[PDB]
Design a protein around this ligand. Structure first.
Ligand SMILES: C#Cc1cc(C#CCOc2ccccc2)cc(CN2CCC(N(CC)CC)CC2)c1O
Ligand SMILES: [Zn+2]
Length: 196
């Protein structure tokens, strides 16, 4: 099977937000609205905002999953490459095979789907801190797009789903990801290509 990537705000007006980090050579994570694409360095913090129009119920959760963007690869599970799955860079919670981790959340849960074998990471959806209008999840991507025997230069999408306590769909959004050494340069390059 293949998970849906259809944008769905749902009853709560769910959608993502991204910071404006620019494209300096030193940047470690940067988002392109024109491309709907996040560019980031390996294992570096990727802040993703969650926005809602109204408060979802207690027990609501937020799941992240990667899929290949190209249809001919969509049924293949996105996982870490044969090198990175063995580099013992565990945080104590994420299985070493999982591409996407959540940083600094002890209530993160990692799922190996018993039927599809796909990986995902899920956290509780809770209200913003006083003074804030949204919540932010910090994700890490644990292989380069180029990793041989893993993503192997194939683009991926991250799908973020807002779910009820049973795992039923409440909302969905998504963005492409490139994990690379120089996110700023690559964003500038791909934006120029799009323009041309
Ligand atoms: C992102 C996020 C987000 C998540 C939740 C949640 C949850 C589930 O857990 C619960 C735990 C205890 C109690 C209840 C739920 C709640 C709010 C509140 N927000 C205030 C601002 C409001 N309008 C501004 C005035 C939007 C215009 C939208 C909702 C979030 O913004
Ligand atoms: Zn790798």
């Amino acid at each position: 099977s293949v998970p849906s990537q259809k944008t769905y705000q749902g009853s709560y007006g769910f959608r993502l937000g991204f910071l404006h980090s620019g494209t300096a050579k030193s940047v470690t994570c940067t988002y392109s609205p024109a491309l709907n694409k996040l560019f980031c360095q390996l294992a570096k913090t990727c802040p993703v905002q969650l926005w809602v129009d109204s408060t979802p119920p207690p027990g609501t959760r937020v799941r992240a999953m990667a899929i290949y963007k190209q249809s001919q690869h969509m049924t293949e599970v996105v996982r870490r490459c044969p090198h990175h799955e063995r580099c013992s860079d565990s945080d104590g919670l994420a299985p070493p095979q999982h591409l996407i981790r959540v940083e600094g959340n002890l209530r993160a849960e990692y799922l190996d789907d018993r039927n599809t074998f796909r990986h995902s990471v899920v956290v509780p959806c809770e209200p913003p801190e006083v003074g804030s209008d949204c919540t932010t999840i910090h994700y890490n991507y644990m292989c380069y797009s180029s990793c041989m025997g893993g993503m192997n230069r194939r683009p991926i999408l991250t799908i973020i789903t807002l779910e009820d306590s049973s795992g039923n769909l409440l909302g969905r959004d998504s963005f492409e990801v490139r994990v690379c050494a120089c996110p700023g340069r690559d964003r500038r390059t791909e934006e120029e290509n799009l323009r041309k």
